[PDB]
Amino acid sequence: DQKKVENVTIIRDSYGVPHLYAKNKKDLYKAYGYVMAQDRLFQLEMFRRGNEGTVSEIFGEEYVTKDEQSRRDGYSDQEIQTMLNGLDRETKQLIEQFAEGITAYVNEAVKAPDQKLSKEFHDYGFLPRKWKATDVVRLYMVSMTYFMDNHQELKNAEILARLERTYGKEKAVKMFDDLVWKNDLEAPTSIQPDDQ
Amino acid sequence: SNAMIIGAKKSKSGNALLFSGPQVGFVAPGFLYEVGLHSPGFDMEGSGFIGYPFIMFGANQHLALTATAGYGNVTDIFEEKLNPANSTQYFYKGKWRNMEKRTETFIVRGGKSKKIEETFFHTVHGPVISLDAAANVAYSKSWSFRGTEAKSIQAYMKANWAKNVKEFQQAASEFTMSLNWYYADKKGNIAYYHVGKYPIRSNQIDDRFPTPGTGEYEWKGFQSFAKNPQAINPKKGYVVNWNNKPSKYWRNGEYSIVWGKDNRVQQFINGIEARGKVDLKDLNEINYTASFAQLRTHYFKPLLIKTLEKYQSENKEYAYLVEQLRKWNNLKEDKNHDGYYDAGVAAFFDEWWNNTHDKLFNDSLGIVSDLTREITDHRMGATLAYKVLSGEPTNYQWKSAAAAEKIILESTDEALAKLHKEKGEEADKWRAPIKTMTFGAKSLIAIPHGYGSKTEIIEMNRGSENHYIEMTPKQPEGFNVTPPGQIGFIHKDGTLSEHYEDQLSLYANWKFKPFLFDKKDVKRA
Ligand SMILES: [Ca+2]
Ligand SMILES: [Ca+2]
C-alpha cells in the first residue's frame, strides 16, 4: 500500500518493506526513523537499553553483570554529544532527523498504546521513551563494537603462564607459538600483495 | 560473514556481481532492517543492522556494497603498574597518576526495584576491565576507534551517498572500526578494503599479549589508510571472504587463530575456482555448499582416506569406509527434508574428528583446554591439528608421524565400533538427525529484544540475510532474503504482524524475493 507521512511517500511492498520517496534528505531520514520504529519499536528500545546498561530495569538481576559491563566500557551522553558535534553539520542534522522520526512514532504509540504499543511493552509494564541523536549512536555502538572488542590478549597471557608453570618456559613458548601464531604465511587471503 | 564480488571478466553477463552474507545470528524480530531510500540523486535499497541510519547490504544507483567483520587488531590491553600504597594509582611516564573514578547506579527489577551502585575506573589507556590484585596490576582497554564511532557512522552514510570508486574509497578511508568493505559498480569495477584505524605499535612488544602501561610502549599514531589492505580490480577477477586474512603480511596480533592454513573461506575459493564465468545462480550454489559443508573435510578427509588405504588389506572395514568417504560430497544436507542428513558417512566423519581432536591434544593441553579448545577446534579451521596430522613443520613436536597415524586409526576404530553397536554396519543406518534452530528472542548483544519465533529450520552455516546483485547497465538487479520478516510488531492481543515471519519459508527453502529498485516495479510488488 501507498501512504503519506508528512511530505514523504511510503510504499510498502508485499513483504512489508517500506520504500520511501522524499524531496530532500532531511525529510527522508525522518521517515527512515519513523518506519523503523513503526516496525521495531520494542527492539530499538531494548537495544538502546543494552548500550545504556538499563536492561535490568526490565528483565531483572540476570542482566546486572551485562549492564555493568556495558556501562564500564561505554560513554556518557555528553561524550556522545561531543562525538556528534565533530561531524559534518549536514550529517549531524540527518542523524537528528532520524531520531525525530523514531520519536514521532513513540509519541503516536504512547497516545494510542493499546493499538500501537507492541505486546512486550504491555506485558513488561513500561513505556518507550523519546529519542535524541545520541541514542542513535548508542544503537550503532551496541552491535558494531561486538565485532571489534575482545580480551584475547588476557586469555593468551593465561595460556602461556599455565603452560609455563607445568611444562617450563622453553616448551611453553614453543607450544604457544603453535597455538597463536605470529603469521601463517599459508593462510588463504582475499587479495594478493601484487593487487594492493 | 561471507561475501563475494565478481568483476566483469569473471561474470557470464559481463556485469559486476555482488553477494552478501552477514552472520549476526537468527532472531525474531531480525537483526537486520530492510528499506528503500529515494531522494534527489540518492536511490538505495538494501538492509542494515537494526537502528542504523544507513544500508550495509544492498545497492544504490551506482554501486553495490557489503561488509564482513575484519578481525583486525583494533583493541589492545595495557597492563598498568599499580601503586602498592594506593590501588587507584598507576605509574605512567615517570609519575604516579590517579585513575578517573565513576559511580554508576543500576535499578534492578525484583518484586520491587533495587538500587545497586558500582565504581568504574579509567586510566590514560581506557576503561579498567580486570584486576590482578595479587600482582598489583590493573588491565585497561584501548580501542583504536575510541571516540570515533560517530565518525564511522558518517563514513557509512557517505558510502551510501557515493557514486563511484573515488567517493566510496574516501568514505572507506574515514571508517575507524575493523571491517572488510566490498564494492561493485555499473562500470564493471570491483573493489575491496580492509577498513579501520590501525595503530602504530611499539616494536619492543609481543602484540599477542598485553602491553606494559608505564609509558614506554604507547601507540605512535595510526597508519595511513593507504597502508590498509585494499585492491581495485584485482587481477584474479574476483574477491571472496569468510572473515579470513586480507593479505599475506597483514597481522592481527592476539587473534591470529582465525587466519590459518586451514580456513573456511576455502569453500568459496573451491567453488569459484571450479567454475569458469559465473552468474548469480552459481553464487547461490557456492553459498549452499558453504552453508552445509563439514568444514574439516577439505584437508582432513584426504588425510583420513590416505591413512585407511594403507591398512585396508588388514582391516576389511576400511575399504568400505574409503568408498563411502570418496563418494560423499562433504555436505551435511537434507535434500529430501526427511529430517536426517543424507550421507551416513558424515556421522562417522563427525565422530572420527571429535575423537581425533581429543587424542591429539588431551594429554598436553587438556589442563588448559578451557582456553585452548576454542583455538584448536575453532569454527573457522583447525590449522594446528592439520599440521600435526600431516607432518608439516611446527614449533613444538606434538606427535611423531607414527603416533599421529595411530591416532587417525584408533579414532576410526572407535567411531566405527560405536556406530556398529548402535546403528549397524551399512552407512545408510548411520544417518544423523538434522540439527535445527529457531529465530529466538536474544541476539549477540545478549539481552532479550522480543519474543522470538518457534518455527524450526535446519541449521545453516549461512548469513542472516543474503543479497545477490548484478550491476546491469540500467540498474542493480537480483534477489534477496531477509528472515524472519520485516515487521516485529505483536499486537497487545497477541496477533503477530502478517510480516513477522513470512520470509522464513524462503530462507529455509533456498528461495528469494526480487530486488526492487525501479519505482514502477516497487508499486507492483
Ligand atoms: Ca591487540
Ligand atoms: Ca535427508
From TrEMBL, chain A:
Signal peptide (from-to): none
Residue positions binding Ca(2+) 1: 153
Keywords from the named record: Calcium, Metal-binding
Protein name per Swiss-Prot or TrEMBL: Uncharacterized protein
Shown chain mapped onto the complete sequence: 26 to 221 of 805
From TrEMBL, chain B:
Keyword match Secreted: no
Residues where Ca(2+) 2 binds: 334, 336, 338, 340, 342
Swiss-Prot/TrEMBL keywords: Calcium, Metal-binding
Keyword Calcium among record annotations: yes
Transmembrane segments annotated in the record for this chain: none
Binding site for Ca(2+) 1: 73, 75-76, 254
Entry protein name: Uncharacterized protein
Residue numbers of the full-length protein present here: 268 to 794 of 805
